[PDB]
Design a protein around this motif. Structure first.
Motif, PDB file in Angstrom:
ATOM      1  N   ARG A  63       0.836  -1.191   0.000  1.00  0.00           N
ATOM      2  CA  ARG A  63       0.000   0.000   0.000  1.00  0.00           C
ATOM      3  C   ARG A  63       0.875   1.247   0.000  1.00  0.00           C
ATOM      4  NH1 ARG A  63      -4.683  -0.367   2.316  1.00  0.00           N
ATOM      5  NH2 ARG A  63      -5.231   1.602   1.281  1.00  0.00           N
ATOM      6  N   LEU A  64       1.804   1.323   0.953  1.00  0.00           N
ATOM      7  CA  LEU A  64       2.671   2.490   1.031  1.00  0.00           C
ATOM      8  C   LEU A  64       3.454   2.689  -0.265  1.00  0.00           C
ATOM      9  CD1 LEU A  64       3.946   4.866   2.067  1.00  0.00           C
ATOM     10  CD2 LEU A  64       5.288   3.561   3.712  1.00  0.00           C
ATOM     11  N   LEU A  65       4.061   1.620  -0.767  1.00  0.00           N
ATOM     12  CA  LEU A  65       4.830   1.718  -1.997  1.00  0.00           C
ATOM     13  C   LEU A  65       3.964   2.097  -3.197  1.00  0.00           C
ATOM     14  CD1 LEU A  65       7.496   1.331  -0.926  1.00  0.00           C
ATOM     15  CD2 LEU A  65       7.522  -1.022  -1.759  1.00  0.00           C
ATOM     16  N   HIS A  97      13.386   1.396  -9.734  1.00  0.00           N
ATOM     17  CA  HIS A  97      14.577   1.702 -10.532  1.00  0.00           C
ATOM     18  C   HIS A  97      15.811   1.308  -9.731  1.00  0.00           C
ATOM     19  CE1 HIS A  97      12.621   3.970 -13.749  1.00  0.00           C
ATOM     20  NE2 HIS A  97      11.967   4.682 -12.848  1.00  0.00           N
ATOM     21  N   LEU A  98      16.827   0.806 -10.417  1.00  0.00           N
ATOM     22  CA  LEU A  98      18.060   0.417  -9.756  1.00  0.00           C
ATOM     23  C   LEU A  98      18.881   1.685  -9.548  1.00  0.00           C
ATOM     24  CD1 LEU A  98      19.831  -1.942  -8.803  1.00  0.00           C
ATOM     25  CD2 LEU A  98      20.968  -1.839 -11.034  1.00  0.00           C
ATOM     26  N   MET A  99      19.399   1.878  -8.337  1.00  0.00           N
ATOM     27  CA  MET A  99      20.215   3.053  -8.042  1.00  0.00           C
ATOM     28  C   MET A  99      21.700   2.729  -7.924  1.00  0.00           C
ATOM     29  SD  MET A  99      18.454   5.721  -8.206  1.00  0.00           S
ATOM     30  CE  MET A  99      18.221   7.208  -7.217  1.00  0.00           C
ATOM     31  N   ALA A 101      24.295   3.715  -5.825  1.00  0.00           N
ATOM     32  CA  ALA A 101      24.853   3.314  -4.537  1.00  0.00           C
ATOM     33  C   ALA A 101      24.227   4.051  -3.361  1.00  0.00           C
ATOM     34  CB  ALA A 101      26.364   3.537  -4.536  1.00  0.00           C
ATOM     35  N   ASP A 102      24.576   3.608  -2.158  1.00  0.00           N
ATOM     36  CA  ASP A 102      24.075   4.211  -0.930  1.00  0.00           C
ATOM     37  C   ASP A 102      24.829   5.501  -0.657  1.00  0.00           C
ATOM     38  OD1 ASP A 102      22.623   1.686  -0.372  1.00  0.00           O
ATOM     39  OD2 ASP A 102      24.628   0.929   0.136  1.00  0.00           O
ATOM     40  N   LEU A 103      24.419   6.198   0.392  1.00  0.00           N
ATOM     41  CA  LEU A 103      25.090   7.423   0.773  1.00  0.00           C
ATOM     42  C   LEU A 103      26.280   6.994   1.622  1.00  0.00           C
ATOM     43  CD1 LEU A 103      25.073  10.423   0.597  1.00  0.00           C
ATOM     44  CD2 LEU A 103      23.710  10.513   2.689  1.00  0.00           C
TER      45      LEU A 103
HETATM   46  C1  B10 Z   1      10.091  -1.653   4.394  1.00  0.00           C
HETATM   47  O1  B10 Z   1       8.973  -1.096   3.677  1.00  0.00           O
HETATM   48  C2  B10 Z   1       9.076   0.289   3.437  1.00  0.00           C
HETATM   49  C3  B10 Z   1       9.541   0.734   2.164  1.00  0.00           C
HETATM   50  N1  B10 Z   1       9.873  -0.258   1.252  1.00  0.00           N
HETATM   51  C4  B10 Z   1      11.117  -0.324   0.702  1.00  0.00           C
HETATM   52  O2  B10 Z   1      11.973   0.523   0.982  1.00  0.00           O
HETATM   53  N2  B10 Z   1      11.360  -1.389  -0.143  1.00  0.00           N
HETATM   54  C5  B10 Z   1      12.512  -1.549  -0.924  1.00  0.00           C
HETATM   55  C6  B10 Z   1      13.808  -1.225  -0.378  1.00  0.00           C
HETATM   56  C7  B10 Z   1      14.995  -1.353  -1.114  1.00  0.00           C
HETATM   57  C8  B10 Z   1      14.994  -1.824  -2.454  1.00  0.00           C
HETATM   58  C9  B10 Z   1      16.363  -1.875  -3.093  1.00  0.00           C
HETATM   59  C10 B10 Z   1      17.367  -2.809  -2.670  1.00  0.00           C
HETATM   60  C11 B10 Z   1      18.659  -2.812  -3.281  1.00  0.00           C
HETATM   61  C12 B10 Z   1      18.889  -1.853  -4.314  1.00  0.00           C
HETATM   62  C13 B10 Z   1      20.234  -1.777  -5.006  1.00  0.00           C
HETATM   63  N3  B10 Z   1      21.269  -1.205  -4.127  1.00  0.00           N
HETATM   64  C14 B10 Z   1      21.228   0.281  -4.294  1.00  0.00           C
HETATM   65  C15 B10 Z   1      22.428   0.953  -3.582  1.00  0.00           C
HETATM   66  O3  B10 Z   1      23.662   0.374  -4.048  1.00  0.00           O
HETATM   67  C16 B10 Z   1      23.744  -1.045  -3.796  1.00  0.00           C
HETATM   68  C17 B10 Z   1      22.593  -1.774  -4.525  1.00  0.00           C
HETATM   69  N4  B10 Z   1      17.907  -0.978  -4.690  1.00  0.00           N
HETATM   70  C18 B10 Z   1      16.681  -0.945  -4.136  1.00  0.00           C
HETATM   71  C19 B10 Z   1      13.724  -2.195  -3.100  1.00  0.00           C
HETATM   72  C20 B10 Z   1      13.631  -2.689  -4.460  1.00  0.00           C
HETATM   73  C21 B10 Z   1      12.354  -3.026  -5.023  1.00  0.00           C
HETATM   74  C22 B10 Z   1      11.148  -2.877  -4.255  1.00  0.00           C
HETATM   75  C23 B10 Z   1      11.201  -2.390  -2.909  1.00  0.00           C
HETATM   76  C24 B10 Z   1      12.455  -2.043  -2.297  1.00  0.00           C
HETATM   77  C25 B10 Z   1       9.647   2.151   1.908  1.00  0.00           C
HETATM   78  C26 B10 Z   1       9.286   3.118   2.939  1.00  0.00           C
HETATM   79  C27 B10 Z   1       9.401   4.649   2.679  1.00  0.00           C
HETATM   80  C28 B10 Z   1       8.536   5.062   1.460  1.00  0.00           C
HETATM   81  C29 B10 Z   1       8.934   5.529   3.882  1.00  0.00           C
HETATM   82  C30 B10 Z   1      10.885   4.978   2.426  1.00  0.00           C
HETATM   83  C31 B10 Z   1       8.825   2.618   4.203  1.00  0.00           C
HETATM   84  C32 B10 Z   1       8.719   1.224   4.454  1.00  0.00           C
HETATM   85  N5  B10 Z   1       8.280   0.802   5.666  1.00  0.00           N
HETATM   86  S1  B10 Z   1       6.783   0.170   5.880  1.00  0.00           S
HETATM   87  C33 B10 Z   1       5.706   0.305   4.469  1.00  0.00           C
HETATM   88  O4  B10 Z   1       7.031  -1.232   6.111  1.00  0.00           O
HETATM   89  O5  B10 Z   1       6.223   0.928   6.949  1.00  0.00           O
END
Ligand code: B10
Length: 330
Positions: A63-65, A97-99, A101-103
């Motif tokens: 939902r959030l996403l 989208h693929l990013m 890197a991290d900060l």
């Molecule tokens: C845990 O669920 C949450 C998510 N979901 C979330 O962050 N999910 C994901 C987090 C991270 C990657 C991800 C992982 C690795 C890389 C590649 N990395 C990038 C950096 O360099 C190394 C490789 N890129 C993206 C994802 C990819 C596809 C789909 C979802 C992904 C987002 C948020 C905010 C909107 C407030 C920020 C809150 C919650 N909390 S809640 C709803 O539960 O309350």
């Protein structure tokens, strides 16, 4: 319906549409989306409906996403499941989208220019203003949860660096009644680290964390002390503020005076007195990027589900509905 294909990555089974090719572990997988030629990140939820707690969490994230639509916040590019019906529905795959890197993997090279810090922090705040306008609190803001590209553009996300080092004091003291500025505190610690090169509060256990924090932002004042109901909590925060105090100016000597002024506004013990994302964006430190007409808020977000106690199968069906009702953006 697309045509899926199976595969095993690190003892992990992955079944995704042929559209996504060359899956690579990074559980999350980097892949090549053939429909656009762009690299994407594919996140497979662990055991989404193993328990009511998991089921609701799964629903919560979908939902959030599904609602996040901001340049500086992870957005949902696609969501799918190999299951052809609710009966066999058991897995959820999310795509963004693929990013680059991290900060975290961007500060391990050299201290960034003040201009570079202005831009990165500006984007965090711009994203945070958005998320906060949807009545949502991050709670785990830190460098590892910040994705930046070759253009220095930033996106905030949440992986389901030390959380605690960027954690607001009221959270480690379990005051339960956290306000949104809890994220502003994290931003303050982040910005401090980008400017000085080092972790502002490098504590071992949370106790050590609290001690390091209070010695910097000072012993709780009378005004804050009156809002603490618990007497043992009131006394506890005082016991933790018995170290030889320190001052700001000192810790951030050299930095832009506008920068240290903003830090003194984010790193405030009393959360009711911390500057908000919106106010912060208007701070002179960001004069160069601030634009009142391009700092959007979010559409009303319906999270009435949060105050619901339902059976796993109910959470599972609601989640399934969200999967099939997904329509990708332009
Ligand atoms: C845990 O669920 C949450 C998510 N979901 C979330 O962050 N999910 C994901 C987090 C991270 C990657 C991800 C992982 C690795 C890389 C590649 N990395 C990038 C950096 O360099 C190394 C490789 N890129 C993206 C994802 C990819 C596809 C789909 C979802 C992904 C987002 C948020 C905010 C909107 C407030 C920020 C809150 C919650 N909390 S809640 C709803 O539960 O309350």
């Amino acid at each position: 319906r697309p045509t899926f294909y199976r595969q095993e990555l690190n003892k992990t089974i992955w079944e995704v549409p042929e559209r996504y090719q060359n899956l690579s572990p990074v559980s999350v997988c980097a892949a090549f989306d053939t429909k656009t030629g762009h690299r994407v990140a594919v996140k497979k939820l662990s055991r989404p409906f193993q328990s009511i707690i998991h089921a609701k969490r799964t629903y919560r994230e979908l939902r959030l996403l599904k609602h996040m639509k901001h340049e500086n916040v992870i957005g949902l590019l696609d969501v799918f499941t190999p299951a052809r019906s609710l009966e066999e529905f058991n897995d959820v795959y999310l795509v963004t989208h693929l990013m680059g890197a991290d900060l975290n993997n961007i500060v391990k090279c050299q201290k960034l220019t003040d201009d570079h810090v202005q831009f990165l922090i500006y984007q965090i705040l711009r994203g945070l203003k958005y998320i906060h306008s949807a009545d949502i609190i991050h709670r785990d803001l830190k460098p590892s949860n910040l994705a930046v590209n070759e253009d220095c553009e930033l996106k905030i996300l949440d992986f389901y660096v030390a959380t605690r080092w960027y954690r607001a004091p009221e959270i480690m003291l379990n005051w339960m009644h956290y306000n949104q500025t809890v994220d502003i505190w994290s931003v303050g610690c982040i910005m401090a680290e980008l400017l000085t090169g080092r972790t502002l509060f490098p504590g071992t256990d949370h106790i050590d964390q609290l001690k390091l924090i209070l010695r910097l932002v000072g012993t709780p004042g009378a005004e804050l002390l009156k809002k603490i109901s618990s007497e043992s909590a009131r006394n506890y925060i005082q016991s933790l503020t018995q170290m030889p105090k320190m001052n700001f100016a000192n810790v951030f000597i050299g930095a832009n005076p506008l920068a240290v002024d903003l830090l003194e506004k984010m790193l405030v013990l009393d959360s009711d007195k911390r500057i908000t994302a919106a106010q912060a964006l208007a701070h002179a430190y960001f004069a160069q990027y601030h634009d009142p007409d391009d700092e959007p808020v979010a559409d009303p977000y319906d999270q009435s589900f949060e105050s619901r106690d339902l059976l796993i199968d109910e959470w599972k069906s609601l989640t399934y509905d969200e999967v099939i009702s997904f329509v990708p953006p332009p």
